[PDB]
RNA sequence: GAGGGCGCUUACCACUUUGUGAUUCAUGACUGGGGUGAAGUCGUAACAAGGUAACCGUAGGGGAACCUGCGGUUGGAUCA
């Protein structure tokens, strides 16, 4: 409860009882999430409110409310998981290998 | 004179000092695991004969669930 701005960030990274999210100058802020959202992945803008600090410019974290439509996402379905969303809203990938351990076709 | 007092000295001994142990609390870089976590990643181990039957003891292996070797049990199916 008592939540602050709501405004367009982009999430860090996830760790499924909160995320890291980064706000629209490079602070780095984390925040955990609505239980009413059903994915959230690295690199996702979404709608969130950095909470409010208990100490005056010490705050522990944020809510994460909304999540915006996605232009790609990254699904691979797995054994008695289902299928996942991995990352999401990406214009271009790179794979990486290399020749150790092996390089296969 | 007898005797007493004072003074001195000795015995006992508190406090106090050094050397060096035992024990206890607080602090403590670092470090060992374990628990609490529905959505995170990695795999599919076990529960059906759970897809190499499982488990126990012990040794070795490797991100990990585990696997292999030896021995035992049925808390195992199918089986005469
Ligand atoms: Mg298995
Ligand atoms: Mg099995
Ligand atoms: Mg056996």
Redesign the pocket.
Known sequence: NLFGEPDEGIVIS?????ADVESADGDVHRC??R?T????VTGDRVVWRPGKPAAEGVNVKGIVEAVHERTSVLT?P????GV???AANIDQIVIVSAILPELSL
């Open positions: 996830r760790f499924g009882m909160h955990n999430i239980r959202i059903r994915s959230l691979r797995d054994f008695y998981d996942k969303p991995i």
